[PDB]
Amino acid sequence: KKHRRTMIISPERLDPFADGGKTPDPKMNARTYMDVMREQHLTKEEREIRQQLAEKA
Amino acid sequence: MTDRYTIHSQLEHLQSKYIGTGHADTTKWEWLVNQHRDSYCSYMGHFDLLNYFAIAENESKARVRFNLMEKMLQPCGPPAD
Amino acid sequence: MDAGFFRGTSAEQDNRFSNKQKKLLKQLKFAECLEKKVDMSKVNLEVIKPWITKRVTEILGFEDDVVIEFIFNQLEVKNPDSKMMQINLTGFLNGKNAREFMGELWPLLLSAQENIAGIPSAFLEL
Amino acid sequence: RLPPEVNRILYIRNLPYKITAEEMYDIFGKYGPIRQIRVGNTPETRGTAYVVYEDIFDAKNACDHLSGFNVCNRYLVVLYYNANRAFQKMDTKKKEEQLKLLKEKYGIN
Amino acid sequence: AKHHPDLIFCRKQAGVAIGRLCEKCDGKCVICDSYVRPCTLVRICDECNYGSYQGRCVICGGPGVSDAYYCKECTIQEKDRDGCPKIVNLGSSKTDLFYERKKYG
Amino acid sequence: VCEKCEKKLGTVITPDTWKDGARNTTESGGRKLNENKALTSKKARFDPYGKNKFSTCRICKSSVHQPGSHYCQGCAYKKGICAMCGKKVLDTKNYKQTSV
Ligand SMILES: [Zn+2]
Ligand SMILES: [Zn+2]
Ligand SMILES: [Zn+2]
Ligand SMILES: [Zn+2]
Ligand SMILES: [Zn+2]
């Protein structure tokens, strides 16, 4: 259960449907879907890296 | 404001369930199309209103019912927008 | 009681919330051509699939087989609802990419059903 | 032999105003090396601080002994900071090039 | 119930299952919650007597001990025709009572 | 009342909470479904034209409060009898009944 205390509140997320699905404004710094999936894939990869580099040393 | 929006969701819930309830923004056209269609259904249902209409026009009852079913599509003309 | 009885209310029971699907069918701006009806028995699908895969892959910047197969699964029914498909993709893609995406996938399926072979015009060419 | 809520970051209340940077680091640096110190500028936050220790055990010890210390004739209130949220995006491009340089360096995958 | 505005009825198409009432709810009307003049028997929809839930209370959900009726006034107004009258959500009052006793006890 | 007269008793509109041996619950059958109140109105209630007219005690001549009773509460308590039929339900040889 303690795993729910590891999770932190994410930064601001974007709403695609807001204002009739308008063209998204650049430099808004709101995460979209593809930003989220990149971060998820990137942390999976980073832990694979540390798990590999653990066994070497 | 929020009370306006909660009234709005409740009334569209009703209108889906019972076809033909209104809300504060029912137009004339909508109200009258509902009461035309309800009238047609009522005429089909009662046997003696349907007899009366089949006598007053010299038609058979099957023709009368079929014409009433044809009128159910646009009973009051096209939508007014 | 194997689960609780209480599981939340469904949308048919609860009047406190408005119908979000109808509301989005009003306010999103859909592409020009999506009103034309499509029959999928008249369309060949597996020739359509690699273009979709490639199209989604470059829009996304990576490949998501769940979005891919989701799009494919929506096209399995006989008359696919195009407006719901643009809504259901708007979350994953920009909502501007979803509009463009339907705007090219839909006339392509129209061209496919007009053919006898099942194949749209630009794919008969090439 | 530690509770899960222990953290490297400490939050400090009742800090006398315009205390020096040197005096701060000297007070908090006894328990271990210090990763970073942030001091509140805005007047609603003014007079309170965050201190990050490089070691988790030093931060544990500084909470355990630091509390109720008397600096500038006032008691010092120390707590753990609960880093419960993130304030910016994690900048996938920098993390990508960093991981590419590590993986290139050790031939991992 | 009529005393709780946030409670919600099932209202699906009722079936051949007879709804029942636990000892606490015995003798009252499911809709308007009265004690007098019982007119008609309550029928519940299929899902609401699925499985283990077969035979629980309509109004609260406890072990049912007698049959539930509509009163005469709900029959005359045809409130007995709206659907399955099983209450599908606990509501704020029931939940608050639990946490309050648990805090104390 | 005595045991044979208890079919002449009136019932309370609300059902009894102790269900066993009740006369007004659904299971007992004394609370019937689809009751028309106008048809069952004169049952076990006073009706000056009907069969239960306003009676007085046969002994003290003061008015009873229960339909179909021939003895007022005090006289029935003191003599030990059923208020409706007058059969004795209590042996009062050793009881100094006190009206106080
Ligand atoms: Zn109950
Ligand atoms: Zn009722
Ligand atoms: Zn139900
Ligand atoms: Zn008397
Ligand atoms: Zn008797």
Q: Please tell me which residue of chain C has the smallest CA distance to E55.
A: C1
A42 and D87 within 8 Å at the Cβ level: the answer is no
C13 lies within 8 A of chain E by CB: yes
Give the HSE-up count for residue B44: Cα atoms under 13 Å, Cβ half-sphere: 16
Interface contact flag, E27 F35, Cβ < 8 Å: no
Please tell me the distance between residue E45's alpha carbon and the centre of ligand 2 in angstroms.
Answer: 19
- CB contact (8 A) between residue F15 and residue E35: yes
Q: Find the CB nearest C9 among E53, E56, E89.
A: E89
How distant is the Cα of E27 from the closest Cα of chain C, in angstroms? 23
Question: Partners of E9 in the beta sheet?
Answer: E87
**Is D49:D76 a contact under the CB 8 Å cutoff?**
no
CATH of domain C20-125: 1.20.1390.10
Cβ contact (<8 Å) for F34 and E27? Answer: no
Beta-carbon contacts of C121 under 8 Å, excluding residues fewer than 6 positions away, are C111, C115
Partners of D80 in the β-ladder: D10
Asked if the Cβ–Cβ distance from E38 to F31 is below 8 Å, we say yes
- Tell me which chain A residue has its CA closest to the CA of residue C99: A21
Which residue range(s) make up the domain with D94? 1-109
Distance to chain A for D50, nearest Cα, Å: 19
Distance CA F40, CA F31 (A): 11
Domain ranges of chain E: 1-105
Helix (H, G, I), strand (E, B), or coil: what is residue D85? strand
Q: Provide the number of CB pairs (under 8 Å) joining chain B to chain C.
A: 14
Question: Quick check: F59 and F69 in contact, CB under 8 A?
Answer: no
**Two tokens, residue B47:** 């046997």
In chain A, alpha helices (H) = 18-21, 33-56
Distance CA A32, CA D92 (A): 13
The two beta strands, D49-53 and D34-39, are antiparallel
Tell me how far apart the alpha carbons of residues D12 and D5 are, in angstroms, rounded to a whole number.
Answer: 17
User: Who contacts C93 (Cβ-Cβ below 8 Å, separation ≥6)?
Assistant: A16, A33, C59, C60, C101
CA distance B41 to B69: 9
Provide the domain count of chain D: 1
C12 strand-pairing partners? none
What is the least distance, in Å, from the CA of B53 to any CA of chain C?
40
* Subunits in contact with chain E (3 or more CB pairs closer than 8 Å): C, F
Tell me which residue of C71, C66, C111 sits closest to C89, measured CA to CA. C71
The nearest CA of chain A is from the CA of D84 a distance in Å of 5
Residue C86: name the closest of C45, C19, C35 by CA. C35
Helix (H, G, I), strand (E, B) or coil at F21: coil
Chain C residues in contact with E9 (beta carbon < 8 A): 13
Q: Using the beta-carbon criterion (under 8 Å), do A20 and C27 form an inter-chain contact?
A: yes
Residue C96, C-beta contacts closer than 8 angstroms, at least 6 positions apart? A21, A22, A23, A24
Cite the annotated binding site of E for Zn(2+) by residue number. 10, 22, 25, 29, 32, 45, 48, 57, 60, 71, 74, 84
Q: Say whether C16 and B5 touch across the interface (CB within 8 A).
A: no
Q: Which residues of E touch C2 (CB under 8 A)?
A: 51-52
Q: Letter for the amino acid at A5?
A: R
d(CA B32, CA B30): 5
The helix/strand/coil state of E18 is strand
Strand, helix or coil for residue F41: coil
Q: Separation of E78 CA from ligand 3 center, angstroms? A: 18
Cα(F79) to ligand 4 centroid in Å equals 10
